[PDB]
Symmetry: D2
Subunit: 260 residues, 4 copies
């Protein structure tokens, strides 16, 4: 062809063998995206459930994904440590995840945001991180849940002072500046009479996705239709679970994830 | 946190400085996607125009993209050689392009496929290639257009034998197996009386996207000075947009016409 | 300076954290080097002991090297998995090892090759390989010893047919072409009456280097001097051991190497 | 083997094609090495000439090295931009240079340090840097010579205050702290009556190594034809060697004089 020599410029990005490959996604400028689409503070179920639906779609479409954790405007996908899906090329792991998720986001938008229209197609930021041991993999996942915890605890009391007390964002910020976790829990209990541990598990722990056995699916109808249909499905599908993954309780319960 | 040590495992993928960064996208399993959505053969305008709309969206949303070429189920995006958009990290260039494009694809689907419904959200394959000189960059782009040419010439006569002559895919394949470009051009002219050079430029050359100054003119009112200046005067509000162009980019004609792309 | 912008072109080559970093060295064109310096076939003690002395020098001079294995014209150096010696930059691991070894090679040449002069300064080929688990690290090391075994078994009978039987290299090659390990062991026992298992352990298993406690060193004098001197040394020094490292016997005996 | 799977863990470090590959070497802890071997201050010819001999050895032994610059305890080696010596693997460029140099250093030590014995085998630090254009390559090289200049100017007056004036290192440091190049040149001229520009070029500009055609002529005998051709005739046996040159490489004068280095 005389122009095919340009293929030799492509660099190799094979991920180290026998290691866990993790792809983390983050909504690009979602702060702006949440404002323009009237997101609920401190948490929006519509948004969080949509993210999970996209993540589920990424798991069924791509291969070798064992566990997936997502919180707020992000979602991590862990590929099997002995995978060889696309010769373990990093670029392939990032882009297939990032595009399938983004595609899914616009597709299933009507399923969660019925009344709120989608003004513009959003973008997503993705990366690949490689972990050699199962301990480092677990520690990464806990780091993600810990981050979910600290941020939700902060945001719940932060928007409480704004929506109920009527304080401005700058005032609510200084009021909570330098406060500890015990303090933030106390303020929610005394000034608003709200117990944090009684808040939804989805907002406190985030969502976790793992493969479990399934027999059939009864989908509800959503124009005057509201009856369940008989739809054939795969023998196994990724199911949402909002539990603690920092403790060993989760890994003892599901040992097939690391010992495959 | 005692868990933040996991950040040190992230590898650095900074692209060599002073080099062109090109991100190429390819629809994953689009052969299946074309069948399930009844794509026109050998070319579908609905599909190609949608791809361009997504590419345009990637160009307005992201930064420092100077030229973008897309053919069939792919699209390449060239970032400025002196860019520093995301500290030049490869992962950032790939994923932002790949997700914005994919997002756009489902979003603007009704604008091109009015009657045909979208059955499922598609996926895309992306990569990054780095080119040190302008020659290597040009050669990559021509390689893409050449590929467009060879494939369209083949597909036009390939589906001609199938839809008009009634031959099976396996028969049309053997008939064209070992034939040259001159031969394929001859068969189209004799058996179907169709001139290839008279086929749409979009199918033969593909689409190219460059920046162009597009101005919009509207009448504006005058509030000062008071001295007989309460009349109307025209005012041009110019905004730079990426405009489609289906021309040859292998020849120097294109680069002479638009020298700002390489000499920025 | 207006010329310091060239520093930004330097690429980062940090090795994945919590992984074993292994630097492997190979003599460049040592086939030519062995001919020009009259090396003994199928093995030369002078050469092998020199390589070990260089390796020992690399271990005392550099830091965090736990085990080092060398066979023939090569030597591997394993750095601690939790090291942070030079911010874990690959380039630093390769070059410091490669240069210190090469330096040492010319320096200590008179200590092993007394009568044979060094005609020219040799070169060495080096690389870095990263291993995530202890199993992959062990498997690499065994792969190196296995290679030592197969090659020595072949070379011993190969040079036997040449030096005793008088066969040409091309003839000895065809004679052993397609033969198994049991066959090569049989030919050595019948045609030359030489038992392979009674050959030096250094030639069969190669050399292994690990850190062990030391009190003092008695160096022998080598002009009419042949008396031992009292020289102060470090409390720990890398000692040669020619044993099997493929089996678990070695790792049970020395568990401090992997569990540090 | 059941153990060969460990080969798949080796990472690829191919340097971007069509780019200059530069390997820079630096003596590890040479500050200590200079003290223990009684190095002359502010400059030692024995040391600098040895470094050059090692660099020359690296150039003859390895392949595709076009220019090499070394100053003080370092030496840079530039490989051809279109090379394919070891499939352009970075690890190969670093280690072969680093070991050959180190080998050479101990080998040729007696050629320069006749009276001073080598107490211990030294080590060297090496790295690889990739440059896409010829401008960036030139700028790197000048950066190296500039560094040579600034440091020698400083060290000459720094050791002058110590060896002639008798000032302590800490005192000489404060005396020159905040001074400019013009100032340092003035102090050398007034207090010690020494003109910097009259100092050896090797210390001020450093050493540069380029390829040069060196021919050797010897008389050859003639055995044919028989017709009165049994006489003597001169015969030039030319062999290309890397020759030391202590000149300015920051200016264009050097590149005009030797254009084959960049336009190969």
């Amino acid at each position: 062809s005389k122009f095919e020599y340009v293929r030799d410029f492509e660099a190799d990005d094979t991920c180290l063998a026998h290691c866990w490959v993790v792809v983390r996604l983050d909504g690009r400028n979602f702060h702006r995206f949440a404002e323009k689409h009237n997101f609920a503070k401190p948490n929006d179920s519509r948004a969080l459930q949509l993210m999970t639906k996209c993540a589920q779609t990424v798991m069924e479409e791509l291969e070798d994904i064992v566990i997936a954790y997502g919180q707020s405007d992000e979602y991590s996908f862990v590929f099997k440590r002995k995978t060889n899906w696309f010769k373990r090329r990093a670029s392939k792991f990032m882009t297939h995840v990032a595009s399938q998720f983004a595609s899914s986001y616009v597709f299933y938008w009507r399923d969660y945001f019925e009344d709120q229209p989608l003004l513009y197609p959003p973008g997503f930021d993705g990366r690949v991180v490689v972990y050699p041991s199962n301990q480092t993999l677990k520690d990464y996942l806990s780091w993600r849940q810990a981050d979910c915890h600290i941020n939700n605890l902060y945001n719940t009391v932060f928007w409480a002072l704004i929506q109920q007390s009527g304080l401005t964002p700058v005032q609510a910020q200084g009021r909570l500046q330098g406060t500890l976790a015990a303090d933030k829990n106390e303020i929610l209990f005394s000034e608003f009479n709200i117990n944090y541990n009684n808040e939804l598990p989805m907002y406190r722990k985030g969502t976790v996705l793992i493969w479990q056995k399934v027999d059939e699916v009864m989908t509800k109808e959503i124009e005057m239709e509201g009856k369940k249909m008989a739809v054939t499905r795969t023998r196994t599908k990724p199911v949402p679970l909002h539990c603690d993954i920092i403790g060993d309780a989760f890994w003892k319960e599901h040992p097939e994830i690391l010992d495959e």
